[PDB]
Amino acid sequence: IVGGYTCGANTVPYQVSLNSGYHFCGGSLINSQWVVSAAHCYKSGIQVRLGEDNINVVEGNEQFISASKSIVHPSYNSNTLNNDIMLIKLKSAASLNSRVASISLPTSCASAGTQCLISGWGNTKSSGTSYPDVLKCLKAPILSDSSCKSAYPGQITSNMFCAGYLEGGKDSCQGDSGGPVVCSGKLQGIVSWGSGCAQKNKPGVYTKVCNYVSWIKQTIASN
Numbered sequence: 001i002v003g004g005y006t007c008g009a010n011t012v013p014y015q016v017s018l019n020s021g022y023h024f025c026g027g028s029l030i031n032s033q034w035v036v037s038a039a040h041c042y043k044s045g046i047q048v049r050l051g052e053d054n055i056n057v058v059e060g061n062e063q064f065i066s067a068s069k070s071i072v073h074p075s076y077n078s079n080t081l082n083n084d085i086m087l088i089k090l091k092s093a094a095s096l097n098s099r100v101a102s103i104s105l106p107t108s109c110a111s112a113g114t115q116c117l118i119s120g121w122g123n124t125k126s127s128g129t130s131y132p133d134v135l136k137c138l139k140a141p142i143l144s145d146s147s148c149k150s151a152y153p154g155q156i157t158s159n160m161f162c163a164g165y166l167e168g169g170k171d172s173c174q175g176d177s178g179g180p181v182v183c184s185g186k187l188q189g190i191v192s193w194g195s196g197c198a199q200k201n202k203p204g205v206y207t208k209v210c211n212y213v214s215w216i217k218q219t220i221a222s223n
């Protein structure tokens with residue numbers, strides 16, 4: 001997260017760190033056995049780390065569970081990043097408490113202007129790479145589709161939305177990928193892509209979760 005702030009330990013109880021010997025992507029806990037992340041975060045050997053704040057120190061509250069299966073959306077296109085969503089089933093269910101809680105899926109999409117909370121342990125430099133030890137947060141608004149499409153002509157599909165600041169200086173970045181964009185307590189987006197990080201007129205693009213709720217429900221129901 002570039003230009004964000006330190007969230008505070010366990011103040012984002014649904015945030016998970018996907019780990020394969022290091023933190024490589026974020027994710028959101030939606031029930032005790034499933035996590036939603038981005039399809040471009042897929043790889044094998046994923047350990048899901050819950051209740052984290054400092055990812056390099058065991059402080060207490062952490063639960064490390066292996067992923068039993070990862071389901072990348074069948075229509076995921078890695079060149080356009082359309083349908084950039086993935087579901088991860090945990091080998092065992094997590095013990096939910098106040099430090100580890102799930103987030104609700106939306107019932108309707110969010111409007112432009114809605115303020116959301118984005119978090120993660122991704123890069124904090126637009127120019128350079130610095131990865132934090134503790135979770136960073138950023139409050140950002142969903143932009144209008146015209147501003148989004150004008151920023152990325154021909155690359156925005158109906159399954160994407162832009163959120164952020166056109167003046168630059170504040171955005172999600174590499175590492176935050178797969179993590180949550182929560183608006184009014186509902187998971188509305190997944191950190192997906194953008195040109196660089198925090199560059200002027202290049203807001204972050206997110207997967208539009210409201211378009212995948214039936215898919216998520218049917219898939220979880222059959223697995």
Ligand SMILES: [Ca+2]
Pocket residue numbers: 052053054055056057058059060062
């Ligand atoms: Ca830790």
Ligand SMILES: [Zn+2]
Pocket residue numbers: 040173174175176177178191192193
């Ligand atoms: Zn990414």
